[PDB]
Design an enzyme around this catalytic site. Structure first.
Site, mmCIF file in Angstrom:
data_model
loop_
_atom_site.group_PDB
_atom_site.id
_atom_site.type_symbol
_atom_site.label_atom_id
_atom_site.label_comp_id
_atom_site.label_asym_id
_atom_site.label_seq_id
_atom_site.Cartn_x
_atom_site.Cartn_y
_atom_site.Cartn_z
ATOM 1 N N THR C 15 -25.298 44.235 -16.763
ATOM 2 C CA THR C 15 -26.686 43.958 -17.222
ATOM 3 C C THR C 15 -27.629 45.041 -16.885
ATOM 4 O O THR C 15 -27.357 45.842 -15.965
ATOM 5 C CB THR C 15 -27.233 42.680 -16.593
ATOM 6 N N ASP C 16 -28.713 45.137 -17.598
ATOM 7 C CA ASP C 16 -29.821 45.952 -17.217
ATOM 8 C C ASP C 16 -31.009 45.047 -16.895
ATOM 9 O O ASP C 16 -30.939 43.838 -16.905
ATOM 10 C CB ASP C 16 -30.058 47.024 -18.191
ATOM 11 N N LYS C 17 -32.116 45.754 -16.588
ATOM 12 C CA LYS C 17 -33.306 44.998 -16.110
ATOM 13 C C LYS C 17 -33.900 44.129 -17.291
ATOM 14 O O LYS C 17 -34.625 43.199 -16.841
ATOM 15 C CB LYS C 17 -34.289 45.954 -15.526
ATOM 16 N N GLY C 19 -32.077 41.900 -18.749
ATOM 17 C CA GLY C 19 -31.149 40.810 -18.684
ATOM 18 C C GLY C 19 -30.103 40.746 -19.767
ATOM 19 O O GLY C 19 -29.251 39.806 -19.889
ATOM 20 N N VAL C 20 -29.980 41.865 -20.487
ATOM 21 C CA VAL C 20 -29.012 41.975 -21.576
ATOM 22 C C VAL C 20 -27.894 42.982 -21.073
ATOM 23 O O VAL C 20 -28.104 43.692 -20.127
ATOM 24 C CB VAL C 20 -29.612 42.475 -22.861
#
Lengths: 149, 149, 155, 155
Positions: C15-17, C19-20
């Protein structure tokens, strides 16, 4: 075109068993170069995110002409090939430490509201960004060649 | 101990130029195994995040006894060495595809509020998690040995 | 087309920041899928590497139709759009847990010598892989639709 | 001690769903910083690998005192806490942009032959590296405090 130049030093961690930079890591390098182009135009993506607007990648293309090795220092040339108020297409070239073209590619980005995930016109939310991008698009169309710093 | 067993297939992307799984990737495998342990105890970490509580790593330890290679299928054994309402210490063993002990390690986790990053007591926020972890801790202290599923 | 289906469970680390799933991680999922295709067709990429031959990606395309929010179990559909003895183009579709088309993309692959990185012809080094790919290519041109899998000789 | 300072600027790709730098990426930052130390001491790890010797990590510790929220420019302080001709232990401190101590940790390294992965003694293959690390260990024992950098012969 109006372009930026970003220097990246390849990491050991970015290698694979072939002994070259893993092909999936190149999107990260494009992202470093794109955020550097945005900075050099005078803007902060971190700022935009502070306002509830995010900018996802909708298309990634990478064409690998030569392998890159640890611990090469490379340069990424970034420009905006297409700008409209709904989407931007960035293009990239990566030059290896010997100055040779190693990689080309592109990313299309849109802007969406973070709550909704609904797309948005950039001129309605960030007219400063729109003005700058529209200016650059007109310079690129006239054939101007400049490095932004 | 009460333990889980998690199967992980090594990816080509997780290799480095030495031709083994890069040492930095092991934290990712410990996380997969820990989330599997939580799921087998009957909880969902995603559920906890939906409530505004997150659980950061505060300490990571990895001891690499043998290299692991692509495309090995490995098994991770996970248990809670120490439970308190303020932190948990998970321990791990990784067995390579020949069934040999390849790696040991540990992670300490706390729980904090998402908005302020302030630490919380598990019992105050998730009494049902607390009851389960407490019950496991007491079985662990009795020397019980069982695979959870 | 002749195709495989690979199931992948997203990881928190991917994930990245937002949330994906970080857009750069999809190449890894195409690799997992492509290696599952090759296995199901009857071959082992690790056995190719044991002969001193590597197969790197030379072109990558990913078109993101929907974000993938973690947690998620996805299914990756893989097929060979174009085969020649010098290069292969794989195409992919990724479906989310709801069955919706989240992503499409493609990868071009070559085979080279590990030591010199010189390109080689698959028919000279791996005639058995060539015969299988060439058979698939002909079936694909005839519009055959088959899911390959372990345990069924579906060709 | 004798130490280096390495500046790292966090990447968006390094973030996870909490909006912080994912805890598994710190090993890569310790790697960048260790390689910087090595370069500032006057050596090239690439050159070591050209001679068929590799240096893998055999033990990793990370103690996370504060989260590192993206964007951030951090400073990594690196030193060699223990050197012998068979293993080295490096220690690290990471300071955030406000100057606060965010993280500490350590890595143990050995040197092995690339072909067989068998361990070597550094003095039998790289007398120059051994002499420099032995000098630094002596200076560290005496309590010298020196930031090594390019362009200054600080030792």
């Amino acid at each position: 075109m109006i372009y930026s130049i970003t220097e990246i030093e390849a990491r050991y961690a970015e290698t694979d068993k072939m002994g070259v930079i893993y092909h999936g890591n190149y999107a990260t390098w494009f992202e470093v170069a794109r955020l550097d182009y945005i900075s050099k135009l005078g803007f902060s993506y971190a700022d935009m995110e502070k306002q509830g607007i995010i900018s996802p990648v909708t298309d990634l293309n990478v064409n690998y002409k030569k392998s890159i090795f640890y611990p090469e220092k490379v340069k990424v040339k970034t420009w905006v090939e297409k700008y409209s108020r709904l989407r931007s297409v960035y293009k990239y070239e990566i030059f290896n430490e010997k100055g040779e073209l190693a990689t080309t590619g592109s990313t299309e980005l849109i802007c969406i509201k973070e709550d909704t995930f609904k797309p948005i016109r950039l001129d309605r939310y960030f007219p400063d960004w729109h003005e700058a991008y529209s200016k650059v698009q007109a310079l690129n169309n006239e054939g101007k060649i400049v490095e932004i710093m």
